[PDB]
Amino acid sequence: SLHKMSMMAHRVKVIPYSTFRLNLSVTSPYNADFDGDEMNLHVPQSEETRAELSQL
Amino acid sequence: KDQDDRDHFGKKRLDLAGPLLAQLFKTLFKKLTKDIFRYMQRTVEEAHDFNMKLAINAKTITSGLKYALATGNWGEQKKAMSSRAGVSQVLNRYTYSS
């Protein structure tokens, strides 16, 4: 995570198969290619903490 | 003349399975040699009949090689800190070419 666009708040879509799926135009700031790259998800636990994600 | 190339592959050597075992066996045999001497003193003092089986410790060279080959720290276990690790890896069996 080299800059703040390497952590961005997303909107869950529950889908099948074992991959995280992201829109391609969002590849540029995560610097992700799909050659076996893995990524990290963190779930906020507070009503307050999700507001920080969604608003900021 | 010009400064010698420190990278010239001709002025390099490769220590393979032979010499690696030779290096280890030397330090392992001098380990045994000087443990027999410690015994010859102990058995000439009390004239306890220099029993051969008591004199030579087989486990010295046996487990001394087994350690190196297993773990990979090419030295004794003493000494397992100051000894170079990396020699002896578990062989790849992914694909025949690997």
Add this chain to the structure above:
Amino acid sequence: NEVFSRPEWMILTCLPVPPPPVRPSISFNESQRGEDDLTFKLADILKANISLETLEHNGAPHHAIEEAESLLQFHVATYMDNDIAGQPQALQKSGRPVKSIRARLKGKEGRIRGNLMGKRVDFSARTVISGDPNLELDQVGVPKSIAKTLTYPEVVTPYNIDRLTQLV
């Protein structure tokens, strides 16, 4: 400073002994038991102490005491720091050097860099990413398996009370 930091306290006279949490023990199977390196290093300090105490009490042979003092000096010193320049390391049977206190705080993976300034966390997940042109920009495809594991503790109010009862 007259209250918190006087020069005379740079010299150790009494030794605070940390409690088990700082140096955990483990009791495996009645013939296997694991003690922390600190518990080892402490026992040496103690043994070296008990020794020097007996020497002073008895007929003090001057040079056999200062010989035992600079042993105590070593064990106490090596316990806070084992990576000392000039001095031999205290080693632990297997040839490995004792993990001093200094060394637990020090590096990345230390208590600072690796347990406080960054730490692993719950409610997290990781997997392979793949591209999807049929998602929105701000969405993310989450495998049903992960979504079933990860949790959000919503609080029951009379708004969600019906919905939550169905979930339960």
Add this chain to the structure above:
Amino acid sequence: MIVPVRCFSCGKVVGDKWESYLNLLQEDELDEGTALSRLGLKRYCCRRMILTHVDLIEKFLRYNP
């Protein structure tokens, strides 16, 4: 590891054509392109299927118990 039944890509039954193939190369002494054509492997998806198959099962059979 045994001739696959059915070509991957297109799905023509290809697993019945093995013994018949090796006969064309051994008994009749035809070259491969000709043999594959005689068999009825028209499109290259089915040709690669037989042309490329390695019969390891024959190696595995050599171990006794």
Add this chain to the structure above:
Amino acid sequence: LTCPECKVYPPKIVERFSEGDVVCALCGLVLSDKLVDTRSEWRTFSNDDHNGDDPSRVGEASNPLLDGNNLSTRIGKGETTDMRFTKELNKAQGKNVKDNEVQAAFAKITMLCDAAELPKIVKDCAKEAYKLCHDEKTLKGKSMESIMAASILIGCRRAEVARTFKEIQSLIHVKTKEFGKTLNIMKNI
């Protein structure tokens, strides 16, 4: 542990290790939340780290059955070390050194097993047989080199390592009838 809500005498409880919880299988009440991995925790005591790079490796395993509880490190050479201070601090350990010395009879058993080509499990039974019978009044005054020669056949007779008594007569020493009576007064203990 027993569920405070239910209380049935056979307390049926599960260790849902994966969620790190201890649950009552009947009512489902969680009885504990802090739960630790014992495998990985034991990895911190007995590891493969001999070099000294692992920050996880922070302790060492000991054997309270054989050597009691004698915690003690050894002054040795490190990376930046003068060969002078090692000698002094070691010559200083010499002045600090009876039954705390009869543990060198373990060194007699270890050097006998290695001369008899015996496994690591046999030595530790011979050392436990010797620790629990060398100060007995039932053995009283038996030939002290024939009671440790008898505790090696006691350690072999449990570790399933076939060693005849005449095989240990060749090692040391053994006086036959002397280490045969001693192999029985211990066998009763």
Add this chain to the structure above:
Amino acid sequence: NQEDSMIMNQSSIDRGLFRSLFFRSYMDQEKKYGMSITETFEKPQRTNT
């Protein structure tokens, strides 16, 4: 199949394409801890275990 990923014929997959066998081997010892303590191979009963 954008950005290094790729599409694969799900029908071809069914017909055998790129399937593989997988074998993992689990080991276990029956260790002897001194004069008395010995591990055992058995089906544990939940009341005394």
Add this chain to the structure above:
Amino acid sequence: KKLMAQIFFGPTYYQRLRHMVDDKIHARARGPMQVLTRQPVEGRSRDGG
């Protein structure tokens, strides 16, 4: 309907590598923790964070 462009097409030798997704995917909302630091344990196989 025809594609307006023509496509490069043909056999290419392709290798099935290690790293399958079901050997990597990993989620954890609370679970085992280290005994020293009381933080989660490390490793997919330890069910850590």
Add this chain to the structure above:
Amino acid sequence: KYELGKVFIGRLPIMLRSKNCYLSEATESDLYKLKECP
């Protein structure tokens, strides 16, 4: 100065296919019976 056998010393691990290994002078059919891959 006037004056008044063969001993085991250790077990050395052998490298497979070496002179000392059983598999060195082994034929193809031989290896198969030995449950080794040629």
Add this chain to the structure above:
DNA sequence: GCACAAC
């Protein structure tokens, strides 16, 4: 193996 910091 740096590169800069104190003896």
Add this chain to the structure above:
RNA sequence: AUAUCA
């Protein structure tokens, strides 16, 4: 500790 992954 080695190997490896982007």
Add this chain to the structure above:
DNA sequence: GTTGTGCTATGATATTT
């Protein structure tokens, strides 16, 4: 002038005593 002293990419995963 010489010595001596800190550090030297992020996360992940799989074995071996």
